[PDB]
Design a protein around this ligand. Sequence first.
Ligand SMILES: [Mg+2]
Ligand SMILES: [Mg+2]
Ligand SMILES: [Zn+2]
Ligand SMILES: [Zn+2]
Ligand SMILES: [Zn+2]
Lengths: 97, 112, 171, 280, 87, 559, 178
Amino acid sequence: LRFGEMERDCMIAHGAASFLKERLMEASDAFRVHICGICGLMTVIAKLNHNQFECKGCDNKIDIYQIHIPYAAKLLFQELMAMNITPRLYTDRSRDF
Amino acid sequence: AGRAALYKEVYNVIASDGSYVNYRHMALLVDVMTTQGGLTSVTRHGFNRSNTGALMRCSFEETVEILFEAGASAELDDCRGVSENVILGQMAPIGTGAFDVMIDEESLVKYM
Amino acid sequence: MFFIKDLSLNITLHPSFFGPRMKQYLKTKLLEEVEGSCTGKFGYILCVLDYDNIDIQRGRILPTDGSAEFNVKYRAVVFKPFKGEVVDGTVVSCSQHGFEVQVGPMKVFVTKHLMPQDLTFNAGSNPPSYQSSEDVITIKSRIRVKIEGCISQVSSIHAIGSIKEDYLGAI
Amino acid sequence: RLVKALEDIMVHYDNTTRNSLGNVIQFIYGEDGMDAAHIEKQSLDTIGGSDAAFEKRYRVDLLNTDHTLDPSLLESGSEILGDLKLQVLLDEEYKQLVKDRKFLREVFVDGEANWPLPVNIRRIIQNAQQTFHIDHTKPSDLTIKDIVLGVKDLQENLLVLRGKNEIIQNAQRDAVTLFCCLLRSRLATRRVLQEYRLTKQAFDWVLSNIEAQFLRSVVHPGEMVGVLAAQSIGEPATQMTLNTFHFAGVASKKVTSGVPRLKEILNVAKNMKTPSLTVY
Amino acid sequence: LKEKAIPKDQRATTPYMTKYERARILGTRALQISMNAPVFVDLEGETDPLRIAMKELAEKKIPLVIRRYLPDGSFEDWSVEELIVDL
Amino acid sequence: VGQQYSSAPLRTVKEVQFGLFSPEEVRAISVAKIRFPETMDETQTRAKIGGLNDPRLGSIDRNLKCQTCQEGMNECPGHFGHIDLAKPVFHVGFIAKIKKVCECVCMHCGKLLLDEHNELMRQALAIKDSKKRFAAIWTLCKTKMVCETDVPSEDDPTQLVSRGGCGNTQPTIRKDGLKLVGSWKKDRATGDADEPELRVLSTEEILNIFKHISVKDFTSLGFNEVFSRPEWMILTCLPVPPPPVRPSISFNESQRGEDDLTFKLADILKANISLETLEHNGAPHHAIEEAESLLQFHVATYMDNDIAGQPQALQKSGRPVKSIRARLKGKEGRIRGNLMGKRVDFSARTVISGDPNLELDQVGVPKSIAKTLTYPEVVTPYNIDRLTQLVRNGPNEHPGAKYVIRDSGDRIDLRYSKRAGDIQLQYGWKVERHIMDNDPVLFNRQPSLHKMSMMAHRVKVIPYSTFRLNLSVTSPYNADFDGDEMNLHVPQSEETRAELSQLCAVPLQIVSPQSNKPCMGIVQDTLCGIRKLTLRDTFIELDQVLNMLYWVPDWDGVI
Amino acid sequence: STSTFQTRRRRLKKVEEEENAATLQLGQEFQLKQINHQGEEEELIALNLSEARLVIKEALVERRRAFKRSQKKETREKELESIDVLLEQTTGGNNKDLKNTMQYLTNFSRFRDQETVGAVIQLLKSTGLHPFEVAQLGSLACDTADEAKTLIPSLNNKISDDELERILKELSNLETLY
RNA sequence: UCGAGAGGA
DNA sequence: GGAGTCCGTGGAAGCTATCAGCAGTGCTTATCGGTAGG
DNA sequence: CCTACCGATAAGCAGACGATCCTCTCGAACCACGGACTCC
Ligand SMILES: [Mg+2]
Ligand SMILES: [Mg+2]
Ligand SMILES: [Zn+2]
Ligand SMILES: [Zn+2]
Ligand SMILES: [Zn+2]
């Protein structure tokens, strides 16, 4: 069944941030991906046995962060990557505001 | 005076057919359109062209047009929004997600 | 050579361990992983200092699971080497190529060419030896090595040290 | 369009209607900061009526033979007569009631008294008469000092914004205003005994039941407010029968109303349709 | 920037527990009990963990602290015992 | 999770920085060469050539491979490659952003047309904005089309002093499809009599001017030092998407069935390979431009085929190609269709029916729907005996289980399994169990217009294939039973269930904050009969009065 | 993964910095003036094999005291066997590295008694030199000023040749017996 | 799967 | 002793026949009267 | 009383947007060269 915008807007209105997040991850897309903390890109070559996590272009096997995000977001950032757009996913806060 | 007139016209349309919608709701969108400097259109170019992070605005019509301008001007989405957390698949800061909860050892030993 | 670093570690804890005997359990999980580890950023982690009074703060109980993400602020001793640092250790391995030196938890290898020209290996001697006059390098023989190069490798730092210089050699 | 423009908008932990970016839209949600569900259309008796019946029903006069309170209502009705120090407070009470009428008439110029306000005091007084079975024959346990001061002490307990500075203290006084105007209207020293017949036991319960209902009535930080408003205005538009007609018998002929008018209001929109101004 | 954090003294937030806090405190506690977390209150033959999470709120034996974030970043750590339950 | 443990930390993405791909970083990031434009067979043999598809990236036909990392179809997220473009080319999106920069920053030197010395330039640069500062810089440098060297006469007494470099005349630029041309004036009683001179402005020329643009000219025009350098708006090296972005799909066994972008990328390689040999071999000058404008078009229509007012680009058979821009365009396209709203699991839908004997918050879930939907219950001392009895009842005796999850990730489908009859059931194991009565669940009626329409409903599992509901709760949804269908979402966690029962409950949403009045009432037979009953005219005798009192569930027992 | 203490910022890729050499060009994490968990800007904590040996001995003697509190409700070769026992009680057999370091630290320790280490630290951490140079002086035995300047090349200009010899002569008198 | 068409509260 | 129909391989199509917007004023570019300073 | 310059209001002309969810069924893709093998 579709949990579109109309469906999301109602769960927002209520304030149930986790039920909406559950329908938007556990009950749907949900994908774990490794990203390089130095740049913020998905350039990491995640080997989950030999542990050669190295990001080609940065040398690091330490500043790498796995993340649970929807498979559609992963695809969207890869589509943006195909059109030369760099959506650097930054785990670290740098402006406070 | 402009927003007081704006509200007078927004209310009168709801007053025309079916009483009613509480002051707080219309005074809100009226205050949204006027706490900008002057007037704000509720269109692809009015409210959508704002101080907000690129991912919240790209969800409304100008999608690839906004995603290109995000990169072209080196924009940084603050990830403080309803929409940008929906895309990220994380518990957004909405109602229940607008506060964090931790556990306390001082309290944990206290209760046994 | 040895440094006291006041570094931290983020640990995620299962909801079932939210019982009075938790502070000690989180402290154990910290030294279970950190004490004995060897990072590139910090070198060999040898011992977690002061088990008493360790700053744990609070554990953010996560979004859809009940696990608490605790950040354990600690202080520990580290063995971080450098390309130039001179050290004195115990000779462990010895063969036609050269010899390995156990400087603390790190093994430092010296090639036949990195050591003096006027030494040479002696095959007809058990354990293997490196002679010259009355100075012999064998199974034990404590030596002084200058770390020419450092190798990061896994969670076990290695070095490619030299003993061919003034004030170097055997000790 | 409404829901997308008002997604970010939510009530914050400092009673402020901000958004994602952090800009202030409203300093207090819907100017009062009350959860819209906890509200009923209540009538302000100070604004409605002639000046003679307002002077008759509210003015308390211990220094008069006919304008005083009869000792069948108050326990100490005869020992309160001619008191200069106690009439100072009954002058203070009626002088704040005369201010309410003149201030309320400046706000609600059309005359309309029935306004949506929290805490149904109309029912609390109705419930005190049933929960305590108070009779009209026997006089009350309270005195003038117990009513006029208790009503004044209740106004301090009706908090909305938590504050210690000149701004938040005034923001708090500005936040209550209309509600504490209804409170002075409903809990006037004369009215408490003349119509309700309230004992000290039942009145002290009424003062706490009003603040308990009022403190419950405050908005919840996290209420999606903008999202809620966008839905609450976009929903009636779906069932909006009648486009450009109505009135009957004012201004005979067309006037853009309903959804066509609503498009102009949201688009903004330098187009005629019905630009008919009004001259007085 | 330097930890901000408003102390347990001088706080501009409501002393009452917000309906979202109540639901998060109950939802998580019921989830933790369901995930085998140790129970502090004396159980009265409760097969449902929310029946327990609700009973734990009555005796106030929940060891949780709510970090209520302000719009400027600064936060106030309110312990579940401090927060009153009118609602 | 995407299945399996990782020795890397997981953290909330607190912010996202946008920029442009540096062709220097793409050549280092890349894992593939992409020499062969062919998409299938080793080298006309079997399983994709090391040119297009899996040279050193994303796996294909049931194989793990993925450049020695393996992981498999569901784990391997694909790896980006690189395509070396024979001649640099513009990005379709930044067409006027390149054009306006050319019109602002003067060419021949790579320096700004105007400077701080101009009073209006100070009035324009005063805002520390990004695009609103550039908005005035675009209109200001648009005119005064000529570079300068010595200009201050009214700030320094009379004599003028140096500031800029070569004072060449900046031409006027306009659009002629993918390319832009400049018009040089001159004509003062010398060459070209009165008509101006036209020059073709190629990407290699524009790029050299953009390369010579200063770091302070970036900040003045709304560009970043390391994220959005204007030189990266022109593509020299193109990143190639992996199979998860543009899949092969697999048509039976010995057939292709490739994605639209695989055929579109091959068309870019075909256009690039012609330029690769034309530039190297005998160069016919005005024959390389006849193919360079086609590579420019291919790299352009691969990103945008919507696109400009003049070209189209069709893939024969007669229909067009689906661009990346059109792929992630609004209304059921990546953002709205898959991120801002999506299809979900643990969801039911059937024709709705009313019920006088249902509770206000209650919902009549069909017997089959509860058996088709499963909630994951964790094995605790509070259930076990309950869970073992559900497990034993299995997937067909209503209160049962479909799968049982072990200590490790191992599903035990009871419908199949050799141990379905046995199973000891250890603590902490999960039991995907059939929906039970009084289980808080989301009940939804499209379109979800207001806070209501999506409420929590006490479950009552009933016979007859129909979504039953209370009669008075017909108002929050606005629907009647003239063939209406309704949605459902069974929550999978103990927390999201409490987020429904202690937040979205039907009685919790009894009063509308829209109008401050309630949003549920007594209607139809319940209201039509209440008028006929509440009268001085009608009374009820002893026989009917005792049944009248008995029907009340909270009756005191006192006549 | 740990990666903490001195962090921020990583402004895209980065050039690496410089090689880790004995020219006091220490790691990008081991700065002369670093931070603390309390907040203060504390100077780099670098210790010699005698100082660091009595710190692990201090941390493991005070570990067993706390580990067994919860359980309720001198001489060269004897130092080798007593440490070997202490390592098995306070830590499990799995920790191979700590055992290899403690055997090395005791066999090469210049000062065995804590009384002498106080005067050594007062003699060295005073001179006005980098804590790593001090961590190498108290660790490595040196008789000649030219021997200490070549083995510790960070000195040369940093200290006078004559004044360094006065320090070196004091350590031979402060030296312990094995 | 894509595209076109058809139907529903 | 030469065919049979096969299918990879290249293949972009071309000269027709006719065109602000459910909104409104969208934003960029030519002609044009007048200011006052040398 | 002229001209180096500076703001005034018209005549062209340019690009991405329009209920939510749902369900059902039909039929795909064709002109010339170079030469491969199997199949008759
Ligand atoms: Mg921003
Ligand atoms: Mg209907
Ligand atoms: Zn990287
Ligand atoms: Zn892979
Ligand atoms: Zn120039």
